[PDB]
Design a binder for these strands. Structure first.
Ligand SMILES: Nc1ncnc2c1ncn2[C@@H]1O[C@H](CSCC[C@H](N)C(=O)O)[C@@H](O)[C@H]1O
Ligand SMILES: [K+]
Ligand SMILES: [Mg+2]
Ligand SMILES: [Mg+2]
Ligand SMILES: [Mg+2]
Ligand SMILES: [Mg+2]
Ligand SMILES: [Mg+2]
Lengths: 150, 85, 326, 137
RNA sequence: AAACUCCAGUUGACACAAAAUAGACUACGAAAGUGGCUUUAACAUAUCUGAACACACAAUAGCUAAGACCCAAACUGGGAUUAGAUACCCCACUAUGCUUAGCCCUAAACCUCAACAGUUAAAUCAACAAAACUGCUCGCCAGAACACUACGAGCCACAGCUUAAAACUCAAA
């Protein structure tokens, strides 16, 4: 568990170093993508999202994922495939807003059940009209008496 | 008193303001200025500061040692050369 | 004579004047009503109450003032229709006064069974038999289950030992019906060691009977004081003139909480006695109200003086809230 | 040419220009991003105020001032007012770590102004005054 | 909400306050302590041990007097929150944190490891903490609670500190 945590941290550091250096790719270096999270199970990568530029960043990352995995294999050589997850805050909100723009709208007390208790009282009206606990360690045993008896 | 527009200054490249801001934020984070401001928002009592610094040093040492151990041991993470034995 | 508590401040906040409509939903003895009539004689006042004896006192005041004061017998829930038929359907009430608790004539009378000091039938019913089908506290204690009685004492009575007192009451009732107030007091006393009869002390730090809270709980549950009070507040707000003065007196924590949350528009389901830390934690969890309708005459509650406490110890816990409809 | 993130040095003649103006002459957009508010002011190279904006001036009040949208609106208003006076290119000088710290810049971009440099002037006391005690929450 | 509205932002001038990064260093000092710069003075002992009281120190808080006062801040006032008071939150502000000269002499003053010398061989060793020990010296302890108490004595201390009991009670702690 802690070993997997350290492995996740190492993967995060390696991916950040690959992102920062220009030797990996001029496109990736120009993007200046920053990673929010890296977690290994396959590997899930989560990068902070800035729409058009976000789509371009996602497309470039998807294109360069294979090269990134190949470069990671040079280092940690047995690296599982890396999955990039775009963190649009709550992605559900972004997708929902996109669909909503796309979509069509057409033309424009007391804390008790007082009633139940009242019913029960009316029903009633109608029908009318400690000790010592011995310690476990002090309990006697007569097995030895029986053994000595015969 | 110092000359201005030198410290913590990043030139925007081809109007890419977001990338320049990200670079500036990363520079400040690398220099620890952001964490410095966050810690300086409220007073951290000296005993608390010493405890936090000692814990951070121990955590960094442990993380480095664990990373070294994992890198050393992962050299054996290859296909089994003597399968069936 | 238990003088109306802080009646001077009630008069000040209401500020009675000639040709104004003032509704007293809790006429009772009428000391507040008498003081209001003393301040203004031409005021048109409504004296609503559930006790038939209170209605008789209101009719006596009507004998004193034939139409300046208008009597009304009924509960807060009925008060809406009663006033609608009375001739104040458009509302426009210039003032509203709402006391709470037990009337002095109610508490003194042992036949009503409102006090453990004097024996009597375990009635604890503000109604004096206008609706004989209305449950009495004796039927309540004899009928309700252990868990039901425990919940009633825990919520209404603010009782810590509901799980114990309810079981003791059930055990006693299984032997004999609980038909006497003093019998119930003895039963509750037996639920604890005898030394604990007067260990509990009032807010005045004066010894009181241990069963008192229990008695209080039953009274509320007999009269549905919380629900009927909420309905009365809603009906008053519906019938109160814009800019009218609403003055309320609350003798215990639950009714004061209800009144305050109604005035400030707070959700009734919100937790009680919230601290600032608890609010911050709640908002942090919720971080991933209705528009105000009142203007408080007094931001803070008004409490009786120490001398007034000595004169009327029963009114010590009274807290006064004054607001104006917006 | 090779782009260098380092700003051009005043007193040294650089080839970089904006609207025929040198970096030392580009107007300055001071942004203050507090936790409860965000203020934006454009000034000339000669410290002449040209436009000012804030969350409170844009109608937002109390907690609503702390939202990033309020800072974006303030940036839009400040950029419009500055552009009315002929401001085109600006040098952003941001201080504080408020929620609007970035949003204000976006507003300026949405306002029509061109940001050529981003500068951080967050007041960081080198062990200066003693800040208030930590909140007991 | 209150508060402020000569309030805020920019620029300039501007401290008897506090000493980012270095510091991922582990240094100095007897301990407490000490992390901006420079300069002066300066870090005892060529055998160890050696004091509740002698000699000299001793964080923070506190007292006395005179200054400074950005900021922080018990207390207090106000605003919220609360059924309500207080507290947690916000604002203003004081003692106080600072300087000078005295006093007080306390701490989870804790590496909870006395000082000095030696050993790593035996049995390594109740457990845990922090590998186990030996020689030597000083200090200290002898069931729990009563008790960081009472009395006595000493002290610049006067709601104080140091030393420190007994009776009744329990079979545990
Ligand atoms: N829901 C309700 N409807 C009508 N009257 C009610 C009521 N709940 C309580 N009351 C009445 O309100 C009064 C409370 S105490 C009476 C106090 C009175 N104002 C005085 O002169 O002191 C009692 O008369 C009680 O019976
Ligand atoms: K440091
Ligand atoms: Mg010596
Ligand atoms: Mg000292
Ligand atoms: Mg001061
Ligand atoms: Mg220490
Ligand atoms: Mg010694």
């Amino acid at each position: 568990h802690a070993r997997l945590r350290a492995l996740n941290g190492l993967l995060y550091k390696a991916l950040t170093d690959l992102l920062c250096t220009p030797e990996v790719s001029q496109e990736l270096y120009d993007l200046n993508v920053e990673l929010s999270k890296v977690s290994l199970t396959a590997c899930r990568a989560y990068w902070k999202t800035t729409a058009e530029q976000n789509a371009h960043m996602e497309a470039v990352l998807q294109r360069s994922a294979a090269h990134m995995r190949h470069l990671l294999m040079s280092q940690l050589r047995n690296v599982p495939p890396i999955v990039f997850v775009q963190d649009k805050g709550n992605a559900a909100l972004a997708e929902l807003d996109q669909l909503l723009a796309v979509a069509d709208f057409g033309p424009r007390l007391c804390g008790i059940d007082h009633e139940a208790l009242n019913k029960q009282i009316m029903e009633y009206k109608r029908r009318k009209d400690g000790r010592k606990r011995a310690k476990p360690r002090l309990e006697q045993d007569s097995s030895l008496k029986s053994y000595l008896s015969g | 008193k110092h000359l201005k527009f030198i410290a913590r200054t990043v030139m925007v490249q081809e109007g890419n303001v977001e990338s320049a801001y990200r670079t500036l934020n990363r520079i400040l984070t690398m220099d620890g200025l952001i964490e410095d401001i966050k810690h300086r928002r409220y007073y951290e009592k000296p005993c608390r500061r010493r405890q936090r610094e000692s814990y951070e040093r121990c955590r960094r040492i442990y993380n480095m040692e664990m990373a070294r151990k994992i890198n050393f041991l992962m050299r054996k993470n290859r296909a089994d050369p003597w399968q069936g034995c | 004579l238990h003088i109306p508590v802080m009646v001077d401040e009630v008069v000040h906040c209401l500020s009675p004047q000639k040709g104004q409509i003032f509704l007293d939903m809790t006429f009772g003895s009428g000391g507040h009503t008498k003081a209001i009539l003393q301040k203004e004689s031409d005021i048109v006042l409504y004296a609503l109450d559930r006790d038939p004896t209170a209605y008789a006192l209101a009719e006596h005041l009507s004998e004193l003032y034939p139409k300046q004061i208008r009597a009304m017998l009924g509960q807060f829930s009925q008060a809406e229709a009663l006033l609608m038929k009375a001739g104040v359907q458009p509302g426009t009430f210039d003032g509203v006064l709402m006391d709470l608790g037990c009337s002095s004539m109610q508490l003194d009378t042992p036949e009503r069974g409102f006090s453990l000091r004097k024996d009597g039938p375990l009635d604890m019913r503000m109604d004096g038999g206008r609706y004989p089908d209305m449950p009495t506290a004796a039927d309540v204690v004899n009928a309700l289950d252990q868990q039901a009685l425990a919940s009633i004492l825990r919520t209404y009575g603010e009782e810590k030992h509901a799980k114990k007192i309810a079981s003791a009451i059930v055990q006693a009732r299984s032997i004999y019906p609980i038909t006497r107030t003093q019998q119930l007091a003895s039963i509750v006393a037996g639920a604890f060691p005898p030394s604990a009869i007067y260990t509990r002390k009032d807010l005045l730090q004066r010894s009181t009977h241990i069963a008192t809270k229990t008695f209080q709980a039953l009274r509320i549950f007999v009269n549905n004081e919380l629900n009927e009070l909420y309905t009365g507040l809603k009906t008053a707000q519906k019938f109160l003139r814009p800019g009218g003065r609403l003055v309320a007196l609350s003798f215990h924590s639950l009714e004061d909480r209800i009144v305050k949350r109604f005035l400030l528009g707070i959700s009734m389901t919100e937790r009680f006695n919230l601290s600032v830390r608890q609010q911050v934690m709640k908002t942090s969890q919720l971080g991933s109200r209705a528009p105000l309708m009142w203007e408080l005459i007094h931001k803070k509650v008004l409490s009786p003086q120490d001398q007034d406490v000595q004169d009327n110890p029963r009114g010590r816990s009274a807290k006064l809230r004054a607001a104006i409809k917006l | 040419t090779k782009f260098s993130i380092y700003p051009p040095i005043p007193g040294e003649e650089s080839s970089l220009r904006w609207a025929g103006k040198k970096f030392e002459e580009i107007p300055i957009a001071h942004i203050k991003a507090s936790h409860n508010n965000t203020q934006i002011q454009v000034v000339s190279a000669s410290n002449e105020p040209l436009a000012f904006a804030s969350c409170g001036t844009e109608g937002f009040r109390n907690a609503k001032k702390g939202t990033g949208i309020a800072a974006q609106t303030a940036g839009i208003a400040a950029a419009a007012r500055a552009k009315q006076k002929g401001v085109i290119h600006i040098r952003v000088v941001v201080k504080g770590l408020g929620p609007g710290r970035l949003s204000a810049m976006h507003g300026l971009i949405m306002g029509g102004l061109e940001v050529i440099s981003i500068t951080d002037n967050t007041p960081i006391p080198h062990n200066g005054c003693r800040p208030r005690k930590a909140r007991k929450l």
